[PDB]
CSV table of C-alpha atoms in Angstrom, one decimal:
chain,number,residue,atom,x,y,z
A,61,UNK,CA,0.0,0.1,0.0
A,62,UNK,CA,1.0,3.6,-0.3
A,63,UNK,CA,0.4,4.3,3.2
A,64,UNK,CA,3.1,1.5,4.1
A,65,UNK,CA,5.5,3.3,1.7
A,66,UNK,CA,4.9,6.8,3.2
A,67,UNK,CA,5.5,5.4,6.7
A,68,UNK,CA,8.6,3.7,5.1
A,69,UNK,CA,9.9,7.2,3.9
A,70,UNK,CA,9.3,8.7,7.4
A,71,UNK,CA,11.3,5.8,8.9
A,72,UNK,CA,14.1,6.3,6.3
A,73,UNK,CA,14.1,10.1,6.9
A,74,UNK,CA,14.3,9.7,10.8
A,75,UNK,CA,17.1,7.2,10.1
A,76,UNK,CA,19.2,9.8,8.2
A,77,UNK,CA,18.5,12.4,10.8
A,78,UNK,CA,19.6,9.9,13.8
A,79,UNK,CA,22.9,9.2,11.8
A,80,UNK,CA,24.0,12.6,11.8
A,81,UNK,CA,23.0,13.0,15.5
A,82,UNK,CA,25.0,10.0,16.4
A,83,UNK,CA,28.0,11.3,14.5
A,84,UNK,CA,27.8,14.6,16.3
A,85,UNK,CA,27.4,12.6,19.9
A,86,UNK,CA,30.4,10.5,18.8
A,87,UNK,CA,32.6,13.6,18.3
A,88,UNK,CA,32.0,14.4,21.8
A,89,UNK,CA,34.0,11.2,22.7
A,90,UNK,CA,37.4,11.9,20.9
A,91,UNK,CA,39.1,9.4,23.3
A,92,UNK,CA,36.6,6.7,22.0
A,93,UNK,CA,35.9,5.4,25.5
A,94,UNK,CA,32.4,4.5,24.2
A,95,UNK,CA,33.0,3.4,20.8
A,96,UNK,CA,32.6,-0.2,21.3
A,97,UNK,CA,31.0,-2.8,23.7
A,98,UNK,CA,32.8,-3.3,27.2
A,99,UNK,CA,34.8,-6.7,26.5
A,100,UNK,CA,33.7,-9.7,28.7
A,101,UNK,CA,37.3,-11.1,27.8
A,102,UNK,CA,38.7,-7.9,30.0
A,103,UNK,CA,36.1,-7.3,32.4
A,104,UNK,CA,34.5,-10.7,32.9
A,105,UNK,CA,32.3,-9.9,35.8
A,106,UNK,CA,30.6,-6.8,33.7
A,107,UNK,CA,27.2,-8.4,33.4
A,108,UNK,CA,26.7,-8.9,37.0
A,109,UNK,CA,27.0,-5.3,37.4
A,110,UNK,CA,25.3,-4.0,34.2
A,111,UNK,CA,22.1,-5.6,32.7
A,112,UNK,CA,21.9,-3.7,29.6
A,113,UNK,CA,25.1,-2.6,27.9
A,114,UNK,CA,25.1,-0.1,25.2
A,115,UNK,CA,28.0,1.4,23.1
A,116,UNK,CA,28.1,3.6,20.1
A,117,UNK,CA,28.8,0.5,17.5
A,118,UNK,CA,25.7,-1.4,19.0
A,119,UNK,CA,23.7,2.0,18.3
A,120,UNK,CA,25.2,2.2,15.0
A,121,UNK,CA,24.0,-1.5,13.9
A,122,UNK,CA,20.7,-0.9,15.2
A,123,UNK,CA,20.4,2.4,13.3
A,124,UNK,CA,21.5,0.8,10.0
A,125,UNK,CA,18.8,-1.8,10.2
A,126,UNK,CA,16.4,1.1,10.8
A,127,UNK,CA,15.8,-0.2,14.2
A,128,UNK,CA,14.8,3.1,15.8
A,129,UNK,CA,11.3,4.0,15.5
A,130,UNK,CA,11.4,7.4,17.1
A,131,UNK,CA,14.1,9.9,19.0
A,132,UNK,CA,13.0,8.5,22.4
A,133,UNK,CA,14.2,5.2,21.5
A,134,UNK,CA,17.7,6.3,20.3
A,135,UNK,CA,17.9,8.5,23.4
A,136,UNK,CA,17.2,5.7,25.8
A,137,UNK,CA,20.2,3.8,24.3
A,138,UNK,CA,22.4,7.0,24.6
A,139,UNK,CA,21.4,7.6,28.2
A,140,UNK,CA,22.3,3.8,28.9
A,141,UNK,CA,26.0,4.5,27.5
A,142,UNK,CA,26.1,7.2,30.2
A,143,UNK,CA,24.4,5.7,33.0
A,144,UNK,CA,26.1,2.3,32.8
A,145,UNK,CA,29.5,4.1,33.0
A,146,UNK,CA,28.7,6.2,36.1
A,147,UNK,CA,27.4,3.1,38.0
A,148,UNK,CA,30.2,0.7,37.0
A,149,UNK,CA,33.1,3.3,37.3
A,150,UNK,CA,33.9,5.4,40.3
A,151,UNK,CA,33.6,9.3,40.4
A,152,UNK,CA,37.5,9.7,40.2
A,153,UNK,CA,38.0,7.9,37.1
A,154,UNK,CA,38.7,8.9,33.3
A,155,UNK,CA,35.7,6.9,32.5
A,156,UNK,CA,33.2,8.4,34.7
A,157,UNK,CA,34.4,12.0,33.9
A,158,UNK,CA,34.3,11.2,30.1
A,159,UNK,CA,30.6,10.0,30.6
A,160,UNK,CA,29.7,13.4,32.4
A,161,UNK,CA,31.4,15.4,29.5
A,162,UNK,CA,29.3,13.3,26.9
A,163,UNK,CA,26.2,13.9,28.9
A,164,UNK,CA,26.8,17.6,28.9
A,165,UNK,CA,27.9,18.1,25.5
A,166,UNK,CA,25.3,15.6,24.2
A,167,UNK,CA,22.4,17.4,25.8
A,168,UNK,CA,22.8,20.6,23.3
A,169,UNK,CA,22.7,18.3,20.4
A,170,UNK,CA,19.7,16.5,21.6
A,171,UNK,CA,18.0,19.8,22.5
A,172,UNK,CA,17.9,20.8,18.7
A,173,UNK,CA,17.6,17.3,17.2
A,174,UNK,CA,14.0,17.1,19.4
A,175,UNK,CA,13.1,20.3,17.9
A,176,UNK,CA,14.0,18.9,14.1
A,177,UNK,CA,12.0,15.7,14.6
A,178,UNK,CA,9.0,17.6,15.9
A,179,UNK,CA,9.6,20.3,13.2
A,180,UNK,CA,9.9,17.7,10.2
A,181,UNK,CA,7.4,15.5,11.7
């Protein structure tokens, strides 16, 4: 149906926008601390601590299969990256401090992306 196609064009356009958002968010992590999943070879107990791991590569795979239906879904995943890190790592670590910075710098990007999604529909 033509209705089905039009929904698919909206999903595709959301996907393009989210990809630009994702790149911008990832530029706020020049150390690439959040680029890849936490290794279970190098932190074998990780899953006793964190129930829903997330990282930029896993968000990117989900994005390219058009797996984000709206911005809320994307934001939940971004917030997981941050919130996982601030629980697992202590306050005085390079990791925790990098989360705080990504959160603060990412909030500006997400502020305007929410206007762009509402605005463009």
